Description:
This is part of a larger assembly, with chains A and B.
Chain A: H1 4-14, H2 21-27, E1 36-38, H3 45-50, E2 59-64, H4 67-70, H5 78-88, E3 93-98, H6 107-120, E4 130-135, H7 164-174, H8 178-183, H9 189-206, H10 213-226
Chain B: H1 3-17, H2 25-28, H3 37-61, H4 66-81, H5 87-90, H6 96-104, H7 110-126, H8 130-146, H9 150-160, H10 163-175, H11 179-189, H12 192-202, H13 210-214, H14 224-230, H15 237-241, H16 251-260, H17 281-293, H18 299-306, H19 315-328, H20 336-340, H21 350-365, H22 370-374, H23 376-381, H24 386-399, H25 410-417, H26 427-440, H27 448-455, H28 460-472, H29 481-489, H30 497-501, H31 505-508, H32 526-536, H33 543-553, H34 558-570, H35 578-587, H36 590-602, H37 607-610, H38 626-629
Helix pairs in contact in B: 3-4, 6-8, 7-8, 8-9, 9-10, 16-17, 16-36, 17-19, 18-19, 19-21, 21-24, 24-26, 26-28, 32-34, 33-34, 34-36
PDB class: hydrolase
Chain A: 26S proteasome regulatory subunit 4
Organism of A: Homo sapiens
Amino acid sequence: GGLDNQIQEIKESVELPLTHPEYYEEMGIKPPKGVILYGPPGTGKTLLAKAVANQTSATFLRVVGSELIQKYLGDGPKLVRELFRVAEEHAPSIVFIDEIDAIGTEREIQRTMLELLNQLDGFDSRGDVKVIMATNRIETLDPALIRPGRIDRKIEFPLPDEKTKKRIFQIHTSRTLDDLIMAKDDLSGADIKAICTEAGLMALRERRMKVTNEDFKKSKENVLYKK
Amino acid sequence: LYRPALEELRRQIRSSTTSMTSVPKPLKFLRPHYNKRFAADIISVLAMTMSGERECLKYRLVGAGEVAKEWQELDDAEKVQREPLLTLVKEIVPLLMEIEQVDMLEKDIDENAYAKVCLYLTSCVNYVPEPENSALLRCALGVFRKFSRFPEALRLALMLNDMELVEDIFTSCKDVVMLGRHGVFLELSEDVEEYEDLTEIMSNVQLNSNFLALARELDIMEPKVPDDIYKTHLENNRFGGSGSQVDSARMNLASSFVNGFVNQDKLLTDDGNKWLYKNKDHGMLSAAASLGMILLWDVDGGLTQIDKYLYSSEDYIKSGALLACGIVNSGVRNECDPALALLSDYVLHNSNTMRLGSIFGLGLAYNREDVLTLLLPVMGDSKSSMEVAGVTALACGMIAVGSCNGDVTSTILQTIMEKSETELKDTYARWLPLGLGLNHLGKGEAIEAILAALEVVSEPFRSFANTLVDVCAYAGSGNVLKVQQLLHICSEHFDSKEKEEDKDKKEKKDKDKKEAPADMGAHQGVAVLGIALIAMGEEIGAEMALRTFGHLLRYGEPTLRRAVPLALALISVSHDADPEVSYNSIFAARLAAMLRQLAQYHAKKGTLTLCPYHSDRQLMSQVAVAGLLTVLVSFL
């Protein structure tokens, strides 16, 4: 809600390959770099909702975090080369990487991430697949990732904490604002879609959609106490 | 003295703990006498399960008046309780349903109609047998005739195929006056029988001639063509590109399909000359009928456009021009005589290919007896050309679709006796069951499958004809005996009755698509993979279908690699060009190239759409069939 310009700009951004073939093969752009995203809220659903436009008509691939690397001996970039060869044999796909927080949870991360940086640039392969990287804090990445990695476009997602919460909260009350624009510290599409989906199914349960402030603070207390 | 109290207590405890038959006896012997919680319980749930097991045990045991009086007591009692879709569907299995519906359908129209007719129509075509579905059609003709929402009664005319329904809906829909739309799907919904009976009683009077103007080939197309030219804007890079990368005299045939398939721009149609002269004879027929397939309107313009190719110096030009005259129209019937007169040659003449295009095109334009008496020397000629009896059997078959319980007349008896006359060129024994089964179409209780099982049973040729009669004899009902019989005979040694008899899956369970995905792909016979590929069909194309096209797409046999893009582009009308790019990655023979360009251009229970693909099921032959494969009418 409200982030329509950024989602249509990232829509046109991620909708160049596999679509509009009359100019993609005649002009000759073919960028083998992809985009790199991030967000202070994160939670995977905002960035997954920004890069989710590729999932309409395509084959999706998801690799979240380097946890599968740190849970084993120093194998290093061999699994990255396995994803590179299976991505070469599976060119019509999208390489989506999310939650790059290896330091937010040391010298080896810099060298396997430097090898991932060099191999990610496509020094030995032309335009074959799109690579999308996503993290939470942009300050956690090393400065070596600036020139090779971020070459196409980066997004500046602002955290208002008093505008988007008022918009979405106004959408919920459309069917006492400082308590929820001040108490909450993170939002995404899965919250409005979650409590609105189960709110519609519950409205199918009791056949009325009346929402009282005490029942809404109880349903909020369920999610607050759940975490 | 007060024995109903002891009987009510006895049935109350026996119904309280456990019982299957002893519960309704104190009630049928009690003669019950003398909005609350107690009444809603002892009526709703105790009379629901009580009358459910008594009406079930009496419906399955004997086959009185007590069950009728108690069943009507539950009818009115549930009319007071007003809980639908449970007591109704429970009281379906015990006509009783007719007087029940007309006894209940007074106030609730959309609840019982939408809910009861929706879930009871789906469960009625799924599980309920036909002799009760006819009661659904007649009682639904009653309660829907007295109520609103005419188009569902028009569906009752699609299933009943009766003329009193369309007459009553024409005077009741005419008394209260959109118009061109219900004319469009009014002519699309009606079959060959009820539009000729409709056009004969209405061509008799119609009292205003307006539905006569509508129920022709003028008002189903007069809104379409100008709107299809105006509201749609197609680019020319497809006619120029797909019309530019053609060569090898077969990709140019794929370009004859590019010209043939229309549905705005007409540049590739009139792109100079020599496009038909450089092509072959089969491409002369296909390209000669393409100008007829692009002009299904403007009779005055179609005549002055196709007239140039009439009686030309080449035989296939004028024969394909008569085929074009048969494709452009279906209600003009003014081009019959010039082609019909010269047909009597009997050995070898231009009027044999003009018999192909003219009998086929006239079959597309059409219990007609004069054209069949003229087709008597055609069936008696028995020319070596397969397409003579091809378009003849398909012609009379498409004329005889939707008959009243079929017929065993001397038409199909004559083509069966002359079929068994000479057992040569088995393709005749393959395309004659086309017209046979098309004549079998429209039956509800015909024993013609058993009659063919008595007379037709012979060597596996007419046994393949017999199992084709079994294919067209099982359009769909509650007949799970044909599902276990299907699994039983599915393992036959004959490698064609599996293909067709198992190919019937796309027609038998065409409505309930949840059961259509089966383990046919997990087998090892290429023919079975073809049975699944044909079983895909032409529906909305969910992700499971394309999931099957992922494994079925990559195959080495040219019959399946050629057959996969047709169903791939028919089941999906950014998934249009990406699978075609996959075909470009697989291929980059001639047939796969012509068919992949076909899909490149055309990628972007009605008998008219379910008939013209069983002839496409025999594409694994010479290019002679390709001259008739391009003029299919299943394209909307």
